[PDB]
Each structure stands twice: as structure tokens, then as C-alpha cells.
Amino acid sequence: ATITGAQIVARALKQQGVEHMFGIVGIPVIPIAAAAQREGIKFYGFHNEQSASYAAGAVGYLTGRPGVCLAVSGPGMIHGIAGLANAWSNNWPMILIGGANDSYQNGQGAFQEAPQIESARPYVKYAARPDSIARLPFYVEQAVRTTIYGRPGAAYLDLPGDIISGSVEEAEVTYPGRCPEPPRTLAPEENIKAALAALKTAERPLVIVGKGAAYSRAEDEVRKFVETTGLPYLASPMGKGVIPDDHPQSIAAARSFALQNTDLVVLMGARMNWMMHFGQPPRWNEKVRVIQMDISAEEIGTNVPTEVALVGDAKAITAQLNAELEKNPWSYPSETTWWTGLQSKIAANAATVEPMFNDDSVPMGYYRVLRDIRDLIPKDAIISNEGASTMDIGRTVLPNFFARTRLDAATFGTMGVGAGQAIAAASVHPDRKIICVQGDSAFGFGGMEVETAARYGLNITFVIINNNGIGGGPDELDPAHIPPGAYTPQAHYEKMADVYGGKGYFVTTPDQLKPVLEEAMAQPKPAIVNIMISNKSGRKPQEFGWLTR
Amino acid sequence: ATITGAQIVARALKQQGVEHMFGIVGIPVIPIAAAAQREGIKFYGFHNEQSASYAAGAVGYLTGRPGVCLAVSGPGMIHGIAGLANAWSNNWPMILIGGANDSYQNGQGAFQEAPQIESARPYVKYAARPDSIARLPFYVEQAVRTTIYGRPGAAYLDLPGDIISGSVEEAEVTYPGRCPEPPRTLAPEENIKAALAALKTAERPLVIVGKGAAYSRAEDEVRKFVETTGLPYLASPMGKGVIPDDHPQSIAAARSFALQNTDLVVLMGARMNWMMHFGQPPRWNEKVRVIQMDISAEEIGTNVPTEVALVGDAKAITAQLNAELEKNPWSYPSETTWWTGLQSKIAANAATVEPMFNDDSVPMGYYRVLRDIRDLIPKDAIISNEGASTMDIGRTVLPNFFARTRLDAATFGTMGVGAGQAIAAASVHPDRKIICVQGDSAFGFGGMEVETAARYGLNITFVIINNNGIGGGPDELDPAHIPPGAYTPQAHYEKMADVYGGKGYFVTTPDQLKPVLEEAMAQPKPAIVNIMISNKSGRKPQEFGWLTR
Amino acid sequence: ATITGAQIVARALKQQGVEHMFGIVGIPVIPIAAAAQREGIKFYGFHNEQSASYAAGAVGYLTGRPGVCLAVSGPGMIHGIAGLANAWSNNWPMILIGGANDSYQNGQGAFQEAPQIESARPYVKYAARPDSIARLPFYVEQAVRTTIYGRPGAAYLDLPGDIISGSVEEAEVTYPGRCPEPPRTLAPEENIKAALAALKTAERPLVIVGKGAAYSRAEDEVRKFVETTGLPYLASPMGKGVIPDDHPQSIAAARSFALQNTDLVVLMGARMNWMMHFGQPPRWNEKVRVIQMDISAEEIGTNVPTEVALVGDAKAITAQLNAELEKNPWSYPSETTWWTGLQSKIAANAATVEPMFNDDSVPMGYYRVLRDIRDLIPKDAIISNEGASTMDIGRTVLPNFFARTRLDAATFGTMGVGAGQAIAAASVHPDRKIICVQGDSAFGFGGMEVETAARYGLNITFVIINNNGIGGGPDELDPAHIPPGAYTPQAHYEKMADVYGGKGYFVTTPDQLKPVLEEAMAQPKPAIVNIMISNKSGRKPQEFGWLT
Numbered sequence A, B: 001a002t003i004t005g006a007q008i009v010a011r012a013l014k015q016q017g018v019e020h021m022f023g024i025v026g027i028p029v030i031p032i033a034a035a036a037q038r039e040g041i042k043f044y045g046f047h048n049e050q051s052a053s054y055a056a057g058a059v060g061y062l063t064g065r066p067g068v069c070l071a072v073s074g075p076g077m078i079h080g081i082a083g084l085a086n087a088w089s090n091n092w093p094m095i096l097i098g099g100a101n102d103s104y105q106n107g108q109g110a111f112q113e114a115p116q117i118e119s120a121r122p123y124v125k126y127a128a129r130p131d132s133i134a135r136l137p138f139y140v141e142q143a144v145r146t147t148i149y150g151r152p153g154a155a156y157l158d159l160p161g162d163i164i165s166g167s168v169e170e171a172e173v174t175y176p177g178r179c180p181e182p183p184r185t186l187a188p189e190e191n192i193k194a195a196l197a198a199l200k201t202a203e204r205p206l207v208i209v210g211k212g213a214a215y216s217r218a219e220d221e222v223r224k225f226v227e228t229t230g231l232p233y234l235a236s237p238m239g240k241g242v243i244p245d246d247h248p249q250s251i252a253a254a255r256s257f258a259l260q261n262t263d264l265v266v267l268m269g270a271r272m273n274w275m276m277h278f279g280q281p282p283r284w285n286e287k288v289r290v291i292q293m294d295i296s297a298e299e300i301g302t303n304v305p306t307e308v309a310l311v312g313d314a315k316a317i318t319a320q321l322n323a324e325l326e327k328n329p330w331s332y333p334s335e336t337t338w339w340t341g342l343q344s345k346i347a348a349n350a351a352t353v354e355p356m357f358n359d360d361s362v363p364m365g366y367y368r369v370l371r372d373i374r375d376l377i378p379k380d381a382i383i384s385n386e387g388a389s390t391m392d393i394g395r396t397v398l399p400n401f402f403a404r405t406r407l408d409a410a411t412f413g414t415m416g417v418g419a420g421q422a423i424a425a426a427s428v429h430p431d432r433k434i435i436c437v438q439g440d441s442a443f444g445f446g447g448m449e450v451e452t453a454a455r456y457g458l459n460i461t462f463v464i465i466n467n468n469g470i471g472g473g474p475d476e477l478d479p480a481h482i483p484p485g486a487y488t489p490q491a492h493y494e495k496m497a498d499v500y501g502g503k504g505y506f507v508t509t510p511d512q513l514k515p516v517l518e519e520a521m522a523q524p525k526p527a528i529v530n531i532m533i534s535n536k537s538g539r540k541p542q543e544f545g546w547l548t549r
Numbered sequence C: 001a002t003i004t005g006a007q008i009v010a011r012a013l014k015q016q017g018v019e020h021m022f023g024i025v026g027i028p029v030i031p032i033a034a035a036a037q038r039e040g041i042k043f044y045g046f047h048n049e050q051s052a053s054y055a056a057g058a059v060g061y062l063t064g065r066p067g068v069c070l071a072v073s074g075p076g077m078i079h080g081i082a083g084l085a086n087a088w089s090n091n092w093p094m095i096l097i098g099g100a101n102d103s104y105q106n107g108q109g110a111f112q113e114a115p116q117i118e119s120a121r122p123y124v125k126y127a128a129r130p131d132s133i134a135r136l137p138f139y140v141e142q143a144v145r146t147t148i149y150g151r152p153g154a155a156y157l158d159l160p161g162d163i164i165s166g167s168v169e170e171a172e173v174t175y176p177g178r179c180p181e182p183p184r185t186l187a188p189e190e191n192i193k194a195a196l197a198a199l200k201t202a203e204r205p206l207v208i209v210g211k212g213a214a215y216s217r218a219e220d221e222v223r224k225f226v227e228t229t230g231l232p233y234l235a236s237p238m239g240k241g242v243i244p245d246d247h248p249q250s251i252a253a254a255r256s257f258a259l260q261n262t263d264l265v266v267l268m269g270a271r272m273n274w275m276m277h278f279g280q281p282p283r284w285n286e287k288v289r290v291i292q293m294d295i296s297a298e299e300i301g302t303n304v305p306t307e308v309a310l311v312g313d314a315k316a317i318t319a320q321l322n323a324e325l326e327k328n329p330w331s332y333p334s335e336t337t338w339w340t341g342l343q344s345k346i347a348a349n350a351a352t353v354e355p356m357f358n359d360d361s362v363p364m365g366y367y368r369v370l371r372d373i374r375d376l377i378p379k380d381a382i383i384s385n386e387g388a389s390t391m392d393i394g395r396t397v398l399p400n401f402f403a404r405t406r407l408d409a410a411t412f413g414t415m416g417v418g419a420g421q422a423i424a425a426a427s428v429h430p431d432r433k434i435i436c437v438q439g440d441s442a443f444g445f446g447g448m449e450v451e452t453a454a455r456y457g458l459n460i461t462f463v464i465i466n467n468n469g470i471g472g473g474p475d476e477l478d479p480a481h482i483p484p485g486a487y488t489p490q491a492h493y494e495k496m497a498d499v500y501g502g503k504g505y506f507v508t509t510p511d512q513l514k515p516v517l518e519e520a521m522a523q524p525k526p527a528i529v530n531i532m533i534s535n536k537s538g539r540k541p542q543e544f545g546w547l548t
């Protein structure tokens, strides 16, 4: 009995817990996709590997096991570097499997001969070309384990065509056991006590809940910690829903005030990177104190010093914090000048946006449109939200009630992830509704993948919030002077639903919003709802712009 | 008087002969696109940088000056690596300009902070981050010159946002003169004589005309050489049209016989790489002798030894060959057993395909559909042809009469280039019709760019030859078992023309072909013609498959 | 009041805990070495950056803060990549600071213009070119912290000449506080319990003590763990001395038997890499069970599956194991079939080597020479031991009694480290004797650094065990057919002591060993002892070669 390299790879992947594979077939990886389907891995054929490789990283975030992207040699693999870099930037587990030319044609100018390991290297924890067919399971298990152990990240496997198509006797192949979940590392008890003692000295304490806490599956421990301590908290964009967004201790609507004035912040799986304005003035106080909880020791003390470091797994360390609070109870008072100032700011920002939610002017505004989207999203739906103002106002208006239910442009700020992340969510969660809310520019980066969603019967509804460009475009184009970020005015993207026999809707007036969105979400194929908005509409005013520089 | 980095870069690019810029704006490169338009560079806003970066390389091939791709920091630049690699593989001049985060935020986890120089490195002749605003023109001229001097190739410029947005006094900036065309290097006269003498010893000589001869603009000298010597010749796929494809000395229809039996080949700007089966058995004779004309000395003698090396520019060396033939006339006899065998093979392959051109069976075949496309392509049109069998049979059926009028997947075999290369051709040749003939899979890699063609008023007609997948897909999909390379059956891609107000046509029967194609090509917006074909249709049988392994 | 980039860098390095800098000056880094000395960093000018860069990584191992290598632009930096790679291979904290050409000359073909960041990249956790003079302390702190937090490793700082020589106002510069010691992470309680439960099921358990335990400074807890449990243990080559090598539970003289027959091993900061034969047959049992203690989660389960993963700091995790043994006491019985077999192999291997220690044949053998070296080494000396058989037999014959007192070719198997590691050890431990024991080939990789040791008054004695080549060479060279690994027969390397006015000794017969070594170790300048041995002498025979 013999077996091919392709069949060994597919068996090993399934044994290691891979359940989802996204890519595009061609020389030399056709038999890998075929073998993956026979092993029961779900294979999705995309229209571009760029989108497929973003889907793979999203699987890693959602499941804690790497999604796999399968790409042909040369340009196929290079298209997939996009997803390597997005997983690198977000510390998400993901594997790109790239075919390569037959090894005995190296140097000859073989079909799609390319330095693929060197191209992947900057973005991966692990890059390997297996030396022989019979050792393939060694490399598969090592790749999988390296993506999920330590700080999670990306890996690249380089498979020459002759390793894929060649055969060995089955008896020559040893398969490792399934890589177990990594141990959930703990902080020293002295550091646990030091974190809690420091909290008790703060006049204006703040907890930030980030997507590291979501990735760790720490949501029960984090909610218990925040409720026991009574602390104000802020969710990062993909930390939304770790604690339900309607929780009374959320100060999301006073975010700028909270960061500017806190004297002590607890970072629960969140970085002091650009998203948090580096922890630095003018957005933070120059003397802010930091308790930092991260699996990555090297991240501790980036940009601003850390007073108490909690290095390890967020679920395990937050459980240590909760155990120590049970031993030595403490909570932050419910009546303080901090709470009063936070509540004043929340109420003022609520009053500012309320008229915008209720403005029926045409062309419509973001808040008016997102109001009706919000009121029709099931509470356990997964939201894929991508764009500039479409995503930023979507972040504030569309709540999440469960962890890991918002997928957006994330740390790398990537356009091109929307449909791929929606398809990943549908594959992981076949029983949920997926709502994809994209700006019109965002939609165009991967718009062909609406047919992919349709072909695999995925429960995704596509909503486009269209202002004619990248932050808007004019109503009529001057052919001699097309703005660099404009598109065809009133582009009818919803006609793309006719490609696969779905329903497309073109919305311009507020009386259309509720009936159209309700009907669209009920369709047995993915509907596309193309909603025109004013090119003057934008977010509620802020003292500071989001891009600190 | 002061000037920004963005304005300096745009002025320098225009001074160096850059006329075409393709990309997507965003932080930090918005002011570069604006300044490029003010300087009179044509800027095209794409839906994905992947397609834009392929457009830039095509400009390099068509014009001999680099096309420029403009990309934002991080994922924008990484999307554009695709075009770097395609230009690397084809030795085409091309520049990717990537924004980068502000330099004073390095190390902080800045927005879209990424190792962009290291990501570009494997594919570029030149990668630089300018050290200061006032030296920007030094780097622009050095990048341009490096892409077109020597063996042409790709370059990457890394521009931190503060170099783009900062200003200096105009008096601090020196601008180099426009980089002149590189000198057209000559072979030693002894080698010229040796090449011609070797030709006179051959019993079965063959000339191969490749896209290096096209790039060199050598078409007048090459045609004169082939006609003076009376030699049989074969065009490579993008060498088609250097000599008009209806020339009586073409042996294209006997290609396999010609390569298998020639005893001496003249490579005029063509590599012995995978496209030519490495010059090795079983597709070539083991003792074949090679005269090799290439600008790259390092390419000489790859895979098979070269008997006479002609290193330098193809136009200049072919002129040397023609001058020596005028001094010492010679021609290959018109009546030889070689010619008789070539003509026998041509006639047999003509007889094999003639019934296929005339078969009206539905679902239709490739040859029947391509017959009617061929008969409506203007003789000076530019053809963009991409796919597997759509491109390979398009290569044989659709003739080219002028040099540099076919753009296809080229050396890297890339899917994703079709629409971008058509847009590049339209930008370079505003007075010509561009016909883009894509397989259905090929179409989906960059299908959103039909709106880009429409928005800029480009004279492109999109034809899709649709067999439901990558080499075909079934007529009905089993939801539990979707073939990895299949798409939605009878996908109505022509409805994408409704996005921008163009006309879409759905063709299934042969009586539709001529009226539909005629009307589509006459439209003032880009039409999409979606032509269904049998999933059993394929190319005429061959003794060997194209992928030697 | 203004300050240069060079002065900022030196102040930042000192503040971050850097104490030792090794390198060679020239354009553009001259002012950095001067500023370093003014800050009280110890600077050593070497004869080659290659040796200097190995010294920097050894400081990191010995101290837990990176040593720094200072190199000029272009070839200076490239010579120092050797030390980046050695630190990478051993997970030692180390910084290479390379000068670069002036930034405004990039692209021009500037003096020593080179792609230095890309050259360092494969071996470093961190590589940065500071964007501006005022942010230099940001990069220094970030580089230091990255080398010592998590799995320790190397960093590269790329300093253009105009960042070094340029100035800013002092008020423009902010200095981060000294990087605190890294947090010492712990294993889940259920894993601590599972480790101890597994030990109680084992018929033939074994502890392996590696240089990760030494780097962690876990020696007190490791000794307590091994003594409490009564387990047999094996030290890795640089794990020697974490427990004193004369400890009764060491099974070093039964190494192959122990690895072949153990059914459950506790890896205390040691890898299943080539040095442990990948944990695989034929050197290990196919069904061996593994409890693995390592700070690197990604290392867990390499080559063979791990049954209990103890991810975190070795000192902290061993303290966890000790605390649970206090609650639930257990020890391995002192009379078992396993102990009886281990002791039988120990006694047989002892009987095999005893006549080699007492063999007075000339030319001499390794064991007879190393016997007299051993008996003169002070118990708290640092040993630098490098070569092939010189190092491999030195490993078994020369005991260590304290942690971090043996420095050898380590995980990368590097020749070129011996003098640089001895100089590093002298700098870290000015109160100790440093003894450097090298094969003749190893000596030649960095032999000019004996003058560096003399110039800085370091308490180092250089011993060369000389068999005329790489594993030996002939007594007479056929001048037209020189064997690729041979050197001049009876090459008088000890005459190099005359370069700096030291004492060189040439030894051929056993009566000379003891008086020569005693006198040499007492010299006020570094002495060189060049000891000839037979080119037929070799190590004790083994069933298996070390290179699996």
C-alpha cells in the first residue's frame, strides 16, 4: 500500500485539527484540495488567493487553530502573503501552503519558480520546505504547533510538486498525535497581589479589554473581574462583546475623556500601539501607570513603562486575579468624581448623536442607516465590518453581546478582508447569521467573493454603505479630472447578486431601510443591499483624530 | 518658497518620463496622487492594488519606461508585491512606491508598520527608503535608471509619511536630468560572423522570436533578418506580431515537430526556460546547437550549452547580423526536406482544427467561439488574453500583426493580470481598441476592475469564455461535494456591466456570436460578453503536454 | 547644552544595565567606545570582531544582561554576525551595534555601505536603525528588553554615522528607566501535579539538567528538587555544575545506558536537539515519556511528544515542584533495579578510564594530560574548553562545582569562541581564575586575543592540547601533499606569549605537566602552555558516536 504526498498532507492536517481550507487550485496543488475534501476538511475555492488568505487568519482567531490557505506556485503564493502579514500583525494562527516547482527543475527557470520561503519569511514564525515525502507529518505538526504555541502567528509550508505527486509506502510514514492546546501560563502570585494593590491606589482606574482576551477565551473570567471590582472598562474594537456592549460599566461613549484622564489602566490583552495612541500624550496623561496582561513578554513595556507585568494566558491570569479578590475582597466605589465625569461625557455624546440617528434627510447619513442595520442584527450574529467611516461608525453603533463576534480591519488596518472574514465566520459558525457591512471602496477589494459565499450556501448578507468613494466621491465625474479616490457615482454593486441568482437591492430613502433589510436577511442566497449615503456625512466630531502623529 | 516631499516626488517622476500611475490612495500617499495629477501623470484608482501593480509592469513592457504603482503602507504595499514579482519574472521595468509609517513612530507599533523593504527585496533590482526630503529626486532617478538599464526589472521606493508630508525650501532641491535611453550594446564582430557561419552548417535551422526582441523594439531588424535568410521561425506567445503572424515563414502550426527536429536554433530574445521545455529532450534533440541573443550575459548557456553567444541589445545585434549578410550574402534554400516536413505538419494541423472552427454544436467549443472573435479584432488592436485553455487556444487562433500587441499570463503564468494589463494598454494606446479575452476563472481574479475601465472611459471590451470553472465545472453543483475548481453554473458575469451602466451580453448559441460581438465592441462604455462553452471542449490533441516534467 | 548620539547611546546602555562592551574602533564608532568608557562600561579592543562578538554573547549567558559588540560599518558588522548567530543558537542575550555610512550618502556607493539589517535579520529577535538622534534611548531600551524578555536572544542596532556624530539639545532627549528583570512565569497547577504523578509511575526515571536551568539561576531549586526526589540526573555539557559534578546522584559515567533505558525523562531547561540525539531511537527508547520544562512554548514537543509541558521560568517552575512535594512528599527508592544497572555501568566506565589517567606513554594521551590540568583548577574557576576531543574529553574529566562556570562550543558547535569567552568570563568575574583549554586547531581561530588578555591584565591561563591538527596531523608534512586538517608539526604556539612579554611553556613528557601548569597559572601575565599529545589518542570507546 502506497500513499502520495498530497494524501499524507491532507491526513496530517486533519489529524492536527485543521477543519477549514481556503484557496485556489492549479499546478501543483490540485491533489491536495482533492485529498483534503476526502479527509473531511472543508475546502473553499475563492476568486483570489488574497481574500482566501485573509479568511484563513480569521479562522485562527475564531477557533484557536490555524486556518489554512492553499495556493499554487509563484504568483499564487505571493497573493497569499497578504494573509501571512495580516496574521502576523494580529498574532493570529494561520498556515499558507504554497506549491513550488518540481525540485529537480530548480535553476532551470521552471514554471512559477520563485524564492517563496524568503518572500514569506518577514511575516512568519516558521517557514519550511519538507525534505522528503515520508517526513511530511513532522512538518505539518511542527507548523501547527508553532502557530498556536507562544504568541500565536503565521507559518508557511513550501511544497515542491514532486513531493506532492510522489508516493511512498504507507509503512514508511509516522503521524504525530494531535498537537494539544498549549498550557495556560500563570503569573507569580506576588505579581497578582501587586496588580490588585496598585489598583487600590488609583483615583481614576480604567480596564481595557482587547482581542487578546477574546482570543484566550477569557470572557467569563474578564466579566467576573470587571463586575467584582466595579471598574469602568473600555473595549477595543475587536474586544467588543467579551463583556456585552450594553454592560453598565462600559465607558465606550467617553473614550477620549477616559484615556486622557485615567491614572492607572489595566490592559487585558491589548497593546499600547497605534490603536491606543501609544499610551502617550496628548491622548493619555504623561504619568499614567500601567498593569499589562499579555502572553508575549517582549510586548511588556512598549512605548510606556509597565508598573506590574502579568505575563501568561489571559484566561488563567484573570482567574488568578479573581481568586485573589475572593481571598481579599475589594471593589471600586460606585459614587466617585471619576464615575460622575465619565457619566457626564457619556450623556453628552449620547445627546450629540441622537438627532443623527433620527435624521431622514436624503442623501442619508451614516447614523440613520446604521440605526436600522443595528435593530435587525440577531444578537448572536457575527458582524464583518470594513471601511473607513463605515467601520469606525459601525464600531460605535453596532453592539456585540458575545466574544469573537466582530471581525474588522484589525491591527493592520487592511482593506480586502471583509468578504473573506465573513466566509470564515460562516464556515466556523454554520448555525449563525453573518452580516457583512462594508464601505463601497472596501467592497470592491474582494467583491467577486459574493459568488463564493453563494456557491457554498453560506448565510451571509452583504450590506454596502456607498458614498461614491474612499471617504466619498462626487455625484458626477469630470473625465479630465477624476479624483483619485472616487468611483462611478451611484455604482450599482447590488447587480452583482444577479451573477449567482441572488437578490440585489438599491436603497436611497429611509422608508426603504427596514423592509429591504428584513427581506434581504431572509433570503436563501446572499443578498446585496447597496445603500447610498451623502458624501458629506461623517462621524460625530472629536477633539482628536484617530491617527495620532 | 517651499515644496512637500509629495510634490518633489511627483515632479521628479514626470521629469524621468513616468506617464502612468496605478494604485489606491490612503494614508500616507494621498498627496502623491494629487501631486501626480497636477504634474500631468495619468493616475488610475483601482479596486485592488494587486491588479494595479500588474498594470504598472505592463506599461514597462509596452513603453520601455517603468509603470508606477502607488500603494499605502503595510497591506497596500504587500498587495503590490504581486506586480513586483511579475515584473521580476518577465524582466519588465516597474516601480512600486509604498507609503510607510512616520519614521519617528518606528518601533512603537505604528499604523501599518511593516518590513516593507525586506518584503520587496527578493523581486527587485533596487529597494530604497529615501533618507531625507531634499534627496528625493536622487532616489527617483536612480530607481528609474535601474529599472531600464541592464536587464530590465523592478524597483521599490519606501516613503515614510513624514517624508511625504514634510516640506523643504525649493532652493534645497536639485533635480537630475531625465535618464536617457540606455546604450544599445553590440556583439564582437567575430561573434557576428560565427553566428552566421554556424547557421550555414545547419540542416534544419530554426529562428525563435521572443518578447525580448519585442521589448528591444527590434521588429524591423528581426523581420529583415528572417526574410533575408529565408529561415523558418517560431514566435513565442508574446513574441507574436514582432513578425506579422500571417508571415509565410512562420512554422507556428508545426511547433512540436520544429523543436523536436531542429539541429540549430537562433534564440532572439527568448529563454530556454519552461516555455521552451528547457531546450532539452524529449521536446528537443539531445545535440541541438544554440545561437543565443540576450541582453543578460548570465542567461547565456542556461540548461543547454550555447555555441555562439550574442550578448547585447537585440535591435543593435540584429542590425549587425543584417549588415554582415549584406557584406557576405547567404540565404537558406526554399526547397529542402526540412521545409517539406514543416509544411506537411502545418497542413495536417490545419486539417485537424478546421472542423472545430465550423462546429455549431451547443454548448459551444473554444474554436467556434474564437473564430468569431478573431474575425472582429481590428488589426492594430491590443489583445489581453488570460486563462488556461482560453489563453492557450487564444494564442494559436488570434493573430498579432504588430509587435507588443499581445499581453498574456507571460513567464510567471499569473492569473490576475488580465484587466490590469488591458487598462495599461488602453492608457498607453488611447487611439486603439483593447480586447480582453479571459477564461471565467481568470475573469474573477480582477473582475471589479471593469468599473475602473468604465470610470476612465477606456476603450476596452471584455469577453469571458465560460466553462463553469478552472478548466470547467459541472452544470449543477452538489452542495455536499463542490469541486475545488468549479463556480456557480452559468454565472452571469455580464451583469457586472450594470454596475457602471454598460451593456452585458449572455451568449450560448453560435447565431448570437457575430451580432453580439459587433454590438459590444461598438459601445461607448466597456461591454461584457459572457460566452458559455462546453466543459468538455479543449485544445487540439498533442503528443506532449505543455508542462514538461 | 548639547550631547552627541554617541554620548546618548553610551548613557542609555549604562542605564539599561550594560556593563561589558567588546569590539574594534574605526569610522564611524570611535566616539561610542570613548563615551562608553566615560560612562564606566568596560570596553575591550579586540584583534578581530569575530572573537569580540562571541565574547558579547557569553556575557549575556553569565550575567542575564546582554554584552555588546561594537563594530564599524560594512565588514566590521559582518564579522560580528558570527556572534549574533551563536547567541541565536544558544538563546543568549547579546547586542551587536554596527556603524553605518552617513544616511545622506545612501545610494552613492558610500564608504562601507552595506545591507546590514538584512544581514543580521536571520539571527536576531530585533533589528533597528534609529530614525533620529533624540529617540536613541527608545531603541536602546527596546533592544535590551527584547534580548532578555521571553526566550532570550540577539539584537542588532544599525547606527548611521551622522546619528553618532550629530548633536541635539539635552532637553530634547528622554531616557526610559532601566528595564526591570523579566517576569518569571509559572506552569498551571494541574501540570505541576501531573508531572509529579508521572514520576511516581516510572520504573527508570531520569532528570536532565541543562544550561537553561543555569541561565535561569535555578541551581538552588534544582538541587533541592533532585535531592528531595532522590532521582538520578544527567548534566548537559554546560549544565555541568548546576548541581556540583561530584554529587552522588549524577549518572554522567552511564550516559548512553541512561538515555537508552529511561522510561520517563524530566528535561530541566535542555532541548531534544542534536546534543540529546533528538530524543529518538536508537539512543532513546521509542516509548520514552517526557516532562519538559522550558521558557519557550514553541520548543515543547519538538521531535518527540511531551506528556507534561511545564512552560515558564525554570527557577519558578522548579520552586512550584518543590512546594508541591512539601504538600505531597515522594522520593524514588534508593535501591532499585535501575540504580543497580546505573551503578554497574558507572563502575565499568570508571574501570575503563582509570588506566588512561595513569598512562605515562610519550607522546601523551588526552586523559593523562587532563588529569594534571584537573587537579590544579581552583574549585570556583571558570573553564573555557573548546575543540573536538580536547573539548569532549575535557567535558567528562574536568568537573564543575558551581553553575555557569563552563563555557564551551555550546549548541552551534562553534570554533572561534574560546579566547573571547575566556575574556568575557574574566570581565564578569575579576576575582576568579579563568582557565582556557583548547585544542590546537581551536586555538588558531582566535589566538591573537592572547595579547588582548595580557593588555587588560586578565587572570587567564591558556592551555593548548596539540596533536598537530583537526583531530590530529602527522609528525612530518609531505610538502606537496599537506593533509587538509594538519598544521606545522610541533608548532610552538607558546612563543606567542613573547609578543607581550608573557611566559610560554612547551610540554612533551608527563613529568613536566604538574610543575609547568602550577607555575603558568601563577604568572602575573597570561601564560601559554602548549602540550603535545599523540595523534592516535582519543576518547573512551562508545557504542554510539556523538553525531547521530
Ligand SMILES: Cc1ncc(C[n+]2c(CO)sc(CCOP(=O)(O)OP(=O)(O)O)c2C)c(N)n1
Binding pocket: A386, A387, A388, A389, A390, A391, A413, A414, A415, A416, A438, A439, A440, A441, A442, A443, A465, A467, A469, A470, A471, A472, B024, B025, B026, B027, B072, B075, B076, B079
Ligand atoms: C490594502 C489597503 N489598501 C488601501 C487602504 C487605504 N484605505 C483605508 C485606511 O487606511 S480605508 C479605505 C476605504 C475607505 O472607503 P470606504 O470603504 O468606501 O469607507 P467610507 O469611509 O467611504 O465609508 C482605503 C482604501 C488600506 N487601508 N488597505
Ligand SMILES: Cc1ncc(C[n+]2c(CO)sc(CCOP(=O)(O)OP(=O)(O)O)c2C)c(N)n1
Binding pocket: A024, A025, A026, A027, A072, A075, A076, A079, B386, B387, B388, B389, B390, B391, B413, B414, B415, B416, B438, B439, B440, B441, B442, B443, B465, B467, B469, B470, B471, B472
Ligand atoms: C495567481 C494564480 N492563481 C492560480 C493559478 C492557477 N491557474 C492556472 C495556471 O497555473 S490557469 C487558472 C484559470 C483557468 O481557468 P479559466 O481562466 O476559466 O480558463 P479555462 O481553461 O477554463 O478556459 C488558474 C486558477 C495561477 N496560474 N495563478
Ligand SMILES: Cc1ncc(C[n+]2c(CO)sc(CCOP(=O)(O)OP(=O)(O)O)c2C)c(N)n1
Binding pocket: C386, C387, C388, C389, C390, C391, C413, C414, C415, C416, C438, C439, C440, C441, C442, C443, C465, C467, C469, C470, C471, C472
Ligand atoms: C567555525 C568552525 N569552523 C570549523 C569547525 C569544524 N571543527 C570542529 C566540529 O566538531 S572541531 C574543530 C577543531 C578540532 O581540532 P582541535 O581543536 O585541535 O581539537 P582535537 O580534536 O584535535 O583535540 C573544527 C575545525 C567548527 N566547528 N566551527
Ligand SMILES: Nc1ncnc2c1ncn2[C@@H]1O[C@H](COP(=O)(O)OP(=O)(O)O)[C@@H](O)[C@H]1O
Binding pocket: A090, A091, A151, A152, A209, A210, A211, A212, A213, A215, A216, A236, A237, A238, A239, A269, A270, A271, A272, A273, A275, A293, A294, A295, A296, A299, A312, A313, A314, A315, A411
Ligand atoms: N492567550 C493569550 N493571553 C494573553 N494575551 C494574548 C493571548 N493571545 C494573544 N495575546 C496578546 O493579546 C494582545 C492583543 O493586542 P492587540 O491585537 O493590539 O489587541 P486590540 O487590537 O484589541 O487592542 C497581543 O499583544 C498578544 O500578544
Ligand SMILES: Nc1ncnc2c1ncn2[C@@H]1O[C@H](COP(=O)(O)OP(=O)(O)O)[C@@H](O)[C@H]1O
Binding pocket: B090, B091, B151, B152, B209, B210, B211, B212, B213, B215, B216, B236, B237, B238, B239, B269, B270, B271, B272, B273, B275, B293, B294, B295, B296, B299, B312, B313, B314, B315, B411
Ligand atoms: N533589449 C534587449 N535585448 C536583448 N534581450 C533582451 C532585451 N531586454 C530583455 N531581453 C531578454 O529577453 C529575454 C526574454 O525571454 P523570455 O521572457 O523568456 O521571452 P519569451 O517568453 O518570449 O520566450 C530575457 O532573457 C531578457 O534578458
Ligand SMILES: Nc1ncnc2c1ncn2[C@@H]1O[C@H](COP(=O)(O)OP(=O)(O)O)[C@@H](O)[C@H]1O
Binding pocket: C090, C091, C151, C152, C209, C210, C211, C212, C213, C215, C216, C236, C237, C238, C239, C269, C270, C271, C272, C273, C275, C293, C294, C295, C296, C299, C312, C313, C314, C315, C411
Ligand atoms: N529562564 C529560563 N527558564 C526555562 N528555560 C529557559 C530559560 N532560558 C532559556 N531557557 C530554555 O532552555 C533551553 C536550553 O536548551 P539547550 O540550549 O539545548 O541546553 P543544553 O545545551 O544544556 O541541552 C532552551 O530551549 C531555552 O528556550
Ligand SMILES: [Mg+2]
Binding pocket: A439, A440, A441, A465, A466, A467, A468, A469, A470, A471, A472
Ligand atoms: Mg465610501
Ligand SMILES: [Mg+2]
Binding pocket: B439, B440, B441, B465, B466, B467, B468, B469, B470, B471, B472
Ligand atoms: Mg474556465
Ligand SMILES: [Mg+2]
Binding pocket: C439, C440, C441, C465, C466, C467, C468, C469, C470, C471, C472
Ligand atoms: Mg588538535
